[PDB]
Amino acid sequence: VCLFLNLANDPTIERIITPRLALTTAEFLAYQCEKHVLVILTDMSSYAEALREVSAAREEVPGRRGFPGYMYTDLATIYERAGRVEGRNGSITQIPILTMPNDDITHPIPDLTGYITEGQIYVDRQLHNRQIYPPINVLPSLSRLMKSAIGEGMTRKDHADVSNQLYACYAIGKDVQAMKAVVGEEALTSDDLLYLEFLQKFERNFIAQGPYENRTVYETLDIGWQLLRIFPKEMLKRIPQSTLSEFYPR
Amino acid sequence: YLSQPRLTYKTVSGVNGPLVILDHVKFPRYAEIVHLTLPDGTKRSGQVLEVSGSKAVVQVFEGTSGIDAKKTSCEFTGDILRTPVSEDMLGRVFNGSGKPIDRGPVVLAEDFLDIMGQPINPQCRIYPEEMIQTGISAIDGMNSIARGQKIPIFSAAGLPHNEIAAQICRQAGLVKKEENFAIVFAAMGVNMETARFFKSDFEENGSMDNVCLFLNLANDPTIERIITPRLALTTAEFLAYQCEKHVLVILTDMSSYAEALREVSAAREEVPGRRGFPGYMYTDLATIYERAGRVEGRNGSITQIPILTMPNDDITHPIPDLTGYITEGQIYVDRQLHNRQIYPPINVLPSLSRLMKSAIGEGMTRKDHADVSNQLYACYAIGKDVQAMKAVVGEEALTSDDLLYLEFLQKFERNFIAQGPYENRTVYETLDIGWQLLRIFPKEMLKRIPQSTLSEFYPR
Amino acid sequence: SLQTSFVTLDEAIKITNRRVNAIEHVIIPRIERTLAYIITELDEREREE
Amino acid sequence: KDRIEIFPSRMAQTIMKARLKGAQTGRNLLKKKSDALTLRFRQILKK
Amino acid sequence: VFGGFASCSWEVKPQFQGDNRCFLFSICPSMAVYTHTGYNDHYMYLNHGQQTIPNGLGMGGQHNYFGLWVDVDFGKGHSRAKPTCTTYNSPQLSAQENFQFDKMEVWAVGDKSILDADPEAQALLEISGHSRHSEGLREV
Amino acid sequence: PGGDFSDPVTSATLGIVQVFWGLDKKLAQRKHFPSVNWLISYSKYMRALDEYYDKHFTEFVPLRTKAKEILQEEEDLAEIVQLVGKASLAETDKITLEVAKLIKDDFLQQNGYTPYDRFCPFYKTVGMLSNMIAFYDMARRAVETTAQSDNKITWSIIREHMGEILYKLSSMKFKDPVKDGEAKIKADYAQLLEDMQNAFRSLE
Amino acid sequence: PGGDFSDPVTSATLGIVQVFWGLDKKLAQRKHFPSVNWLISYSKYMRALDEYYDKHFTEFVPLRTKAKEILQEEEDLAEIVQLVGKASLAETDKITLEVAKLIKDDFLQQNGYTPYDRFCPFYKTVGMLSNMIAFYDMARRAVETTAQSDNKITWSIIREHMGEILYKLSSMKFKDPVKDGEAKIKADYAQLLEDMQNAFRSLE
């Protein structure tokens, strides 16, 4: 581990160069030392408030919410120093950490980060109050490199089909829950007391983990099929016949 | 006359975007057209935006690529922008700057008018007291246009407000009960598919012998779009107030005029007012619109139909909010009628014409016009309430009188509002369509219509 | 007569509630969230001016 | 579904403050009209 | 002039209703009366705004092949009993195959609105932003 | 930026382009792809392609006007089910709530990074659209013919007996247009029609 | 810009002027003509005119105090009259909805091209309100002293019995102030008062 610590009372304009000093070490250890590097840039919100600070007294043209004009290519200067290269066996995997102010995903810090990075992991406040660890909202979460990194010959045959169905059951049963608040518990059909059954078993048996579980990629999927046996076979409309005939009945 | 020769300065002392400033300029006018010559042999044209002593800045129209401070000569004409105006330009197509693009000759002028015009004396203006019929039933039956009115057609991006405008350009005319009627069509900032449609529609139907067409594309420069609606009105203020015709001006996509007037004013680093548009936009829209109306002494009139696009269907945008402050009504091309495949999709519930009372009646159309119109407007208003309420309360609550306001609502949107883009109805066959729709109701239920006209027109 | 005024007040209460809840959870939160966007986007139009 | 279509201005702030206030007066009727009907509904069960 | 008689009440339903006393007649071309033949009991018909089965008033025949039909687009109809009818042994009644009419009479022999129904829905419609479109245009 | 469609790059593009389709308001942060956004989506070449359509496919334009009619009617009804809650719905409208749920999940929604849907040929699009509009005509006759008298076939009864057929309508997108043929896909779409026609003859 | 007090021109006029003849757009399609609102419209010249009214007219300020109140108690009833709907109501409120209706169609109602409503002289203006407030207080004094004794009445026994009184109280706005004499109009409003003092003594 190589730690670059700029604390809260450390001076502000050093935070302009702190992710640059850390990533240059990473691009040295990955492309010249052929090591695999995991770069953890915590509170990238404290990057931009020290970049808005230096452009204020410089008096440029301000952009969206007072942040400077060049904020897109500046976070693209930082986030794009990642990946593999040809002829070198090292890699840089980047996980920055943000704080959205007032939990707004349309603030200029998570909205300009989501245009540079490849997916995002969303941590929400509503599952945190309900004592769920980790509180990860899978509805606005994304991995733009998930589509070509899973499948047959990498993890398992039915990985891409389970996650597309666990998406559509959580996205539907969150809409039935907002329909339960209008018409009450009584006016719900028997194939919509299944979608509320899923949410009590999705966010406790799949999402909620505990901070010292090393759940494999097969143990995650084997949890994900006992949630997909909640429904009958003729409602899993995102999973084809070739995978339902083998993986569903157990 | 102008006898003195013109100075061709080469003292370009700075280029900044579209703007070129000069030096050692001897007595420069305001808004004086200059003629630039590039070093590679090409020519541009400009206008003087600010003079200060011996220094004048120049807003070049066609761009600024190539203008160096060494070899570009600016020739100062010593005259404001005046455009060649004639009566035989009815039947031509010019671009946004006055140059003809119908492969024809440049126009042989009768008199060089100035494109800023002059303000009409309010002591010499007469109230509009006849009708321009337009062929469309929803604009003639219920929102009737007076000769000398300004009634904008509001729309949105994706609605058919071009096929409406081209239908009005083919089917406009008097309320006859034609040599002195003309259209002046100005298209500002249209894409290439619209201005080929405007050119291939007015030859395909033979309605070219009375239409002047000022096309101005989006790839064309942004300053030609500023001076386009002042060419189309100076041509109109000649045809009606000197040649005694009834002119109808169509200014398609006036929202792109206010996108260019914001673009010109941002180049001069000026202050923006409401939502980025300039401070002087209320007096710059009224510089266009208030060149209309009938006058005393002459036998001509100018009617204006500007055409807008409300962004994201917000009527509170400054282009519709300020054009509803100067003009006299709305038409409101609607989206919810377009998505159910009705042409023309005109929403008659928010549409208005404030001068409908001086366009209809005895001597103008017929004595039943004012009572059919506001009765169809009442049975379309009730019909829109029934279907709004029957979706929220249920289907079994309708009484038998209550379904009758839905038989009207379906037959109003198929026989009155649905027209087809080449079906030219006169006003006498919009009311005879409207009268066989009022016989859907019995006599006791038509309470907006008086008995003295119910006993003449209703029974058949 | 007492069991026939029960099932008229048993159906009229179970509609009004679905109409207090249809304002508490549908209509009034949508009018509040557009209020919290007008006070935000007009802070932006003051800042650019 | 998440915002009512209008554009931010000073006038459009007072109209969505009035429509919110004009909805809270409707709910204040319907919050107690249900309990006034529930006030008679207990008495029929108390009969 | 033609028409028909219904033996029971008219009721809006998709099924063929009525019994053997319903007959068709004729007056102004000729005067003749056609009683039932019992080949089928497709006697009367009344539908009011569906989309898969026809909408209008009908007597005799079958679907879209009635011996007397009045359509919802009022002032139109047909009597498409080309050889004769099936229920009534009745001819083509009109002069054409698809007539148009202006006078109609229905004579019995022997012997509020939705806008004011729900005061909570007009309270919820005004709260939800949707306007009224008509005040001072309707009565009370 | 920020999922708001009043940004100055969209409304500048709306006045320039000829075709334009944009994602929904609700389904922007949560991926339901593609969506439609009927308030700004349009294509002005819908009249300029009617000579092509009657020549080669010749029954697609009657399908498209109904497929736009189910979707433009569900957007009316979705606001009222969010306010009333399926109570003021006669059973002829509870179908249009459910074929629009079947089109926006199976027909419109296209997983472009699967090998069986990265390219959808236009016979397969019409074949997928023929089988749903046939189902909507066979459902809405099975309600409207048994409506006022007894044996009221509701939408609820249609789901219990035909639960395997509405999965097979959601199985029409899992056809690979290369591993299967062109007349093999059409040989498996008409068998879904001959089982859809034999699934309402058991109901009547 | 559409009837608000949010713009800096309308709100910075009402901080300066004394009279506000406040008009609205909602209260225009009633064909009422004017579009008077009488809830946001004020006049702060009531204290300056307490000498003209008390000297020359000596009766009008208590009628003006009552007539602004009857049109106010109708407002806080009318939200419940819409939602609940006149079912279990007190009978002193039915006075202030029918007498209050008599004001809103026969006192604050105008039409400007007519030969009776292009000029309204003030002695005829206080002459019309001298009867309408007297009918209100006599309807109130009847319903409060006959609330407990014997043969308690409602409003719906009076308006059927006194339907010809409510025609003379509704035909005051249609008497022409231009053709008729100056004293031809007060005696008609002084003869009608004895058809309003004797008429109540036909019920009790």
Side-chain angles (χ1 to χ4, degrees), chain B residues 146-168:
Chain B
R147 311 195 307 186
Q149 211 194 5
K150 304 155 263 283
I151 169 167
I153 292 192
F154 294 157
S155 174
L159 304 181
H161 62 88
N162 293 325
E163 292 182 352
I164 279 170
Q167 199 183 354
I168 296 176

PDB file of all heavy atoms in Angstrom, chain B residues 146-168:
ATOM      1  N   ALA B 146     -58.894  38.578 -39.460  1.00  0.00           N
ATOM      2  CA  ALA B 146     -59.271  39.841 -40.072  1.00  0.00           C
ATOM      3  C   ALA B 146     -58.134  40.387 -40.923  1.00  0.00           C
ATOM      4  O   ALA B 146     -56.962  40.138 -40.649  1.00  0.00           O
ATOM      5  CB  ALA B 146     -59.650  40.853 -39.000  1.00  0.00           C
ATOM      6  N   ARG B 147     -58.488  41.142 -41.965  1.00  0.00           N
ATOM      7  CA  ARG B 147     -57.496  41.712 -42.875  1.00  0.00           C
ATOM      8  C   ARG B 147     -56.821  42.873 -42.166  1.00  0.00           C
ATOM      9  O   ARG B 147     -57.413  43.944 -42.024  1.00  0.00           O
ATOM     10  CB  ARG B 147     -58.139  42.191 -44.174  1.00  0.00           C
ATOM     11  CG  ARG B 147     -59.056  41.190 -44.826  1.00  0.00           C
ATOM     12  CD  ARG B 147     -59.400  41.512 -46.266  1.00  0.00           C
ATOM     13  NE  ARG B 147     -59.929  42.847 -46.467  1.00  0.00           N
ATOM     14  CZ  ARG B 147     -60.400  43.284 -47.626  1.00  0.00           C
ATOM     15  NH1 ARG B 147     -60.451  42.468 -48.674  1.00  0.00           N
ATOM     16  NH2 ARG B 147     -60.850  44.528 -47.724  1.00  0.00           N
ATOM     17  N   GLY B 148     -55.582  42.677 -41.735  1.00  0.00           N
ATOM     18  CA  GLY B 148     -54.907  43.629 -40.883  1.00  0.00           C
ATOM     19  C   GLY B 148     -54.678  43.149 -39.473  1.00  0.00           C
ATOM     20  O   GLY B 148     -54.531  43.975 -38.572  1.00  0.00           O
ATOM     21  N   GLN B 149     -54.660  41.849 -39.253  1.00  0.00           N
ATOM     22  CA  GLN B 149     -54.446  41.276 -37.941  1.00  0.00           C
ATOM     23  C   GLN B 149     -53.061  40.649 -37.873  1.00  0.00           C
ATOM     24  O   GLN B 149     -52.396  40.437 -38.884  1.00  0.00           O
ATOM     25  CB  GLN B 149     -55.521  40.235 -37.650  1.00  0.00           C
ATOM     26  CG  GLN B 149     -55.916  40.079 -36.211  1.00  0.00           C
ATOM     27  CD  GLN B 149     -56.713  38.826 -35.996  1.00  0.00           C
ATOM     28  OE1 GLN B 149     -56.888  38.038 -36.915  1.00  0.00           O
ATOM     29  NE2 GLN B 149     -57.196  38.626 -34.784  1.00  0.00           N
ATOM     30  N   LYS B 150     -52.622  40.362 -36.655  1.00  0.00           N
ATOM     31  CA  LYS B 150     -51.375  39.653 -36.400  1.00  0.00           C
ATOM     32  C   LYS B 150     -51.723  38.470 -35.513  1.00  0.00           C
ATOM     33  O   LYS B 150     -51.978  38.649 -34.321  1.00  0.00           O
ATOM     34  CB  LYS B 150     -50.360  40.563 -35.721  1.00  0.00           C
ATOM     35  CG  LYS B 150     -50.067  41.829 -36.476  1.00  0.00           C
ATOM     36  CD  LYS B 150     -49.590  42.915 -35.544  1.00  0.00           C
ATOM     37  CE  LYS B 150     -50.710  43.853 -35.148  1.00  0.00           C
ATOM     38  NZ  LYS B 150     -51.023  44.817 -36.234  1.00  0.00           N
ATOM     39  N   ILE B 151     -51.771  37.272 -36.079  1.00  0.00           N
ATOM     40  CA  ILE B 151     -52.209  36.130 -35.283  1.00  0.00           C
ATOM     41  C   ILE B 151     -51.187  35.002 -35.403  1.00  0.00           C
ATOM     42  O   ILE B 151     -51.107  34.321 -36.431  1.00  0.00           O
ATOM     43  CB  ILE B 151     -53.640  35.718 -35.675  1.00  0.00           C
ATOM     44  CG1 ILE B 151     -54.037  34.377 -35.065  1.00  0.00           C
ATOM     45  CG2 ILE B 151     -53.865  35.782 -37.181  1.00  0.00           C
ATOM     46  CD1 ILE B 151     -55.498  34.103 -35.175  1.00  0.00           C
ATOM     47  N   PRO B 152     -50.360  34.796 -34.388  1.00  0.00           N
ATOM     48  CA  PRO B 152     -49.305  33.789 -34.482  1.00  0.00           C
ATOM     49  C   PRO B 152     -49.832  32.373 -34.334  1.00  0.00           C
ATOM     50  O   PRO B 152     -50.758  32.092 -33.576  1.00  0.00           O
ATOM     51  CB  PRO B 152     -48.384  34.146 -33.314  1.00  0.00           C
ATOM     52  CG  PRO B 152     -49.266  34.808 -32.347  1.00  0.00           C
ATOM     53  CD  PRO B 152     -50.223  35.602 -33.169  1.00  0.00           C
ATOM     54  N   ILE B 153     -49.214  31.475 -35.081  1.00  0.00           N
ATOM     55  CA  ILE B 153     -49.474  30.050 -34.973  1.00  0.00           C
ATOM     56  C   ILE B 153     -48.372  29.487 -34.087  1.00  0.00           C
ATOM     57  O   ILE B 153     -47.213  29.390 -34.503  1.00  0.00           O
ATOM     58  CB  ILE B 153     -49.521  29.371 -36.346  1.00  0.00           C
ATOM     59  CG1 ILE B 153     -50.755  29.848 -37.113  1.00  0.00           C
ATOM     60  CG2 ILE B 153     -49.531  27.864 -36.210  1.00  0.00           C
ATOM     61  CD1 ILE B 153     -51.091  29.059 -38.350  1.00  0.00           C
ATOM     62  N   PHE B 154     -48.714  29.164 -32.847  1.00  0.00           N
ATOM     63  CA  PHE B 154     -47.758  28.547 -31.942  1.00  0.00           C
ATOM     64  C   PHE B 154     -47.687  27.067 -32.237  1.00  0.00           C
ATOM     65  O   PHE B 154     -48.691  26.448 -32.592  1.00  0.00           O
ATOM     66  CB  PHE B 154     -48.159  28.753 -30.488  1.00  0.00           C
ATOM     67  CG  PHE B 154     -48.120  30.175 -30.046  1.00  0.00           C
ATOM     68  CD1 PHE B 154     -48.862  30.595 -28.967  1.00  0.00           C
ATOM     69  CD2 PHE B 154     -47.332  31.094 -30.697  1.00  0.00           C
ATOM     70  CE1 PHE B 154     -48.823  31.902 -28.566  1.00  0.00           C
ATOM     71  CE2 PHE B 154     -47.308  32.391 -30.299  1.00  0.00           C
ATOM     72  CZ  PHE B 154     -48.049  32.794 -29.232  1.00  0.00           C
ATOM     73  N   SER B 155     -46.502  26.494 -32.090  1.00  0.00           N
ATOM     74  CA  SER B 155     -46.341  25.076 -32.336  1.00  0.00           C
ATOM     75  C   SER B 155     -45.159  24.570 -31.529  1.00  0.00           C
ATOM     76  O   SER B 155     -44.604  25.284 -30.692  1.00  0.00           O
ATOM     77  CB  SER B 155     -46.157  24.802 -33.824  1.00  0.00           C
ATOM     78  OG  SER B 155     -45.858  23.440 -34.009  1.00  0.00           O
ATOM     79  N   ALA B 156     -44.769  23.327 -31.791  1.00  0.00           N
ATOM     80  CA  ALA B 156     -43.625  22.727 -31.128  1.00  0.00           C
ATOM     81  C   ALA B 156     -42.794  21.992 -32.164  1.00  0.00           C
ATOM     82  O   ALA B 156     -43.194  21.844 -33.321  1.00  0.00           O
ATOM     83  CB  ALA B 156     -44.059  21.792 -30.006  1.00  0.00           C
ATOM     84  N   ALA B 157     -41.625  21.529 -31.741  1.00  0.00           N
ATOM     85  CA  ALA B 157     -40.701  20.898 -32.669  1.00  0.00           C
ATOM     86  C   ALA B 157     -41.122  19.461 -32.946  1.00  0.00           C
ATOM     87  O   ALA B 157     -41.051  18.600 -32.067  1.00  0.00           O
ATOM     88  CB  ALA B 157     -39.289  20.943 -32.108  1.00  0.00           C
ATOM     89  N   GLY B 158     -41.553  19.203 -34.178  1.00  0.00           N
ATOM     90  CA  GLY B 158     -42.052  17.910 -34.586  1.00  0.00           C
ATOM     91  C   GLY B 158     -43.479  17.929 -35.087  1.00  0.00           C
ATOM     92  O   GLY B 158     -43.905  16.970 -35.742  1.00  0.00           O
ATOM     93  N   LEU B 159     -44.220  18.988 -34.799  1.00  0.00           N
ATOM     94  CA  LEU B 159     -45.588  19.156 -35.251  1.00  0.00           C
ATOM     95  C   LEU B 159     -45.601  19.665 -36.687  1.00  0.00           C
ATOM     96  O   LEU B 159     -44.614  20.228 -37.157  1.00  0.00           O
ATOM     97  CB  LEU B 159     -46.308  20.125 -34.321  1.00  0.00           C
ATOM     98  CG  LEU B 159     -46.260  19.664 -32.876  1.00  0.00           C
ATOM     99  CD1 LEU B 159     -46.997  20.644 -32.004  1.00  0.00           C
ATOM    100  CD2 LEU B 159     -46.860  18.283 -32.753  1.00  0.00           C
ATOM    101  N   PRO B 160     -46.690  19.464 -37.420  1.00  0.00           N
ATOM    102  CA  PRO B 160     -46.746  19.945 -38.804  1.00  0.00           C
ATOM    103  C   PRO B 160     -47.143  21.411 -38.935  1.00  0.00           C
ATOM    104  O   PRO B 160     -48.223  21.738 -39.418  1.00  0.00           O
ATOM    105  CB  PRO B 160     -47.789  19.021 -39.438  1.00  0.00           C
ATOM    106  CG  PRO B 160     -48.678  18.687 -38.342  1.00  0.00           C
ATOM    107  CD  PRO B 160     -47.813  18.557 -37.137  1.00  0.00           C
ATOM    108  N   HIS B 161     -46.258  22.304 -38.509  1.00  0.00           N
ATOM    109  CA  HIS B 161     -46.534  23.718 -38.710  1.00  0.00           C
ATOM    110  C   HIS B 161     -45.881  24.266 -39.968  1.00  0.00           C
ATOM    111  O   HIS B 161     -45.922  25.479 -40.190  1.00  0.00           O
ATOM    112  CB  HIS B 161     -46.101  24.528 -37.488  1.00  0.00           C
ATOM    113  CG  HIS B 161     -44.639  24.459 -37.197  1.00  0.00           C
ATOM    114  ND1 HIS B 161     -43.731  25.328 -37.755  1.00  0.00           N
ATOM    115  CD2 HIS B 161     -43.930  23.640 -36.391  1.00  0.00           C
ATOM    116  CE1 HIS B 161     -42.522  25.041 -37.312  1.00  0.00           C
ATOM    117  NE2 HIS B 161     -42.616  24.022 -36.481  1.00  0.00           N
ATOM    118  N   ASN B 162     -45.286  23.407 -40.792  1.00  0.00           N
ATOM    119  CA  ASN B 162     -44.830  23.829 -42.109  1.00  0.00           C
ATOM    120  C   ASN B 162     -45.844  23.477 -43.181  1.00  0.00           C
ATOM    121  O   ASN B 162     -46.144  24.314 -44.038  1.00  0.00           O
ATOM    122  CB  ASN B 162     -43.479  23.197 -42.428  1.00  0.00           C
ATOM    123  CG  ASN B 162     -42.377  23.721 -41.541  1.00  0.00           C
ATOM    124  OD1 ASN B 162     -42.372  24.890 -41.170  1.00  0.00           O
ATOM    125  ND2 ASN B 162     -41.443  22.854 -41.180  1.00  0.00           N
ATOM    126  N   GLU B 163     -46.389  22.257 -43.137  1.00  0.00           N
ATOM    127  CA  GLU B 163     -47.474  21.867 -44.029  1.00  0.00           C
ATOM    128  C   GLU B 163     -48.731  22.689 -43.801  1.00  0.00           C
ATOM    129  O   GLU B 163     -49.512  22.865 -44.738  1.00  0.00           O
ATOM    130  CB  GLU B 163     -47.814  20.393 -43.849  1.00  0.00           C
ATOM    131  CG  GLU B 163     -46.749  19.422 -44.298  1.00  0.00           C
ATOM    132  CD  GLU B 163     -47.186  17.976 -44.125  1.00  0.00           C
ATOM    133  OE1 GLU B 163     -48.250  17.746 -43.516  1.00  0.00           O
ATOM    134  OE2 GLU B 163     -46.476  17.069 -44.605  1.00  0.00           O
ATOM    135  N   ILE B 164     -48.952  23.172 -42.578  1.00  0.00           N
ATOM    136  CA  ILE B 164     -50.020  24.135 -42.341  1.00  0.00           C
ATOM    137  C   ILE B 164     -49.711  25.439 -43.056  1.00  0.00           C
ATOM    138  O   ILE B 164     -50.564  25.972 -43.773  1.00  0.00           O
ATOM    139  CB  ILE B 164     -50.223  24.348 -40.830  1.00  0.00           C
ATOM    140  CG1 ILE B 164     -51.067  23.232 -40.249  1.00  0.00           C
ATOM    141  CG2 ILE B 164     -50.914  25.654 -40.537  1.00  0.00           C
ATOM    142  CD1 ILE B 164     -51.100  23.250 -38.756  1.00  0.00           C
ATOM    143  N   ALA B 165     -48.483  25.944 -42.907  1.00  0.00           N
ATOM    144  CA  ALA B 165     -48.095  27.214 -43.511  1.00  0.00           C
ATOM    145  C   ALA B 165     -48.114  27.151 -45.024  1.00  0.00           C
ATOM    146  O   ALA B 165     -48.538  28.108 -45.675  1.00  0.00           O
ATOM    147  CB  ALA B 165     -46.701  27.615 -43.046  1.00  0.00           C
ATOM    148  N   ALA B 166     -47.679  26.038 -45.598  1.00  0.00           N
ATOM    149  CA  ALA B 166     -47.762  25.894 -47.040  1.00  0.00           C
ATOM    150  C   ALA B 166     -49.194  25.690 -47.512  1.00  0.00           C
ATOM    151  O   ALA B 166     -49.515  26.046 -48.645  1.00  0.00           O
ATOM    152  CB  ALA B 166     -46.882  24.740 -47.503  1.00  0.00           C
ATOM    153  N   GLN B 167     -50.071  25.133 -46.677  1.00  0.00           N
ATOM    154  CA  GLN B 167     -51.473  25.054 -47.067  1.00  0.00           C
ATOM    155  C   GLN B 167     -52.124  26.429 -47.045  1.00  0.00           C
ATOM    156  O   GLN B 167     -52.992  26.725 -47.871  1.00  0.00           O
ATOM    157  CB  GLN B 167     -52.232  24.090 -46.158  1.00  0.00           C
ATOM    158  CG  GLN B 167     -53.540  23.618 -46.762  1.00  0.00           C
ATOM    159  CD  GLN B 167     -54.362  22.721 -45.853  1.00  0.00           C
ATOM    160  OE1 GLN B 167     -53.925  22.327 -44.774  1.00  0.00           O
ATOM    161  NE2 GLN B 167     -55.569  22.400 -46.292  1.00  0.00           N
ATOM    162  N   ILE B 168     -51.715  27.283 -46.107  1.00  0.00           N
ATOM    163  CA  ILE B 168     -52.236  28.645 -46.051  1.00  0.00           C
ATOM    164  C   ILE B 168     -51.724  29.454 -47.235  1.00  0.00           C
ATOM    165  O   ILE B 168     -52.450  30.270 -47.806  1.00  0.00           O
ATOM    166  CB  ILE B 168     -51.869  29.284 -44.697  1.00  0.00           C
ATOM    167  CG1 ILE B 168     -52.559  28.532 -43.563  1.00  0.00           C
ATOM    168  CG2 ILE B 168     -52.255  30.744 -44.633  1.00  0.00           C
ATOM    169  CD1 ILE B 168     -52.190  29.015 -42.202  1.00  0.00           C
TER     170      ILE B 168
END
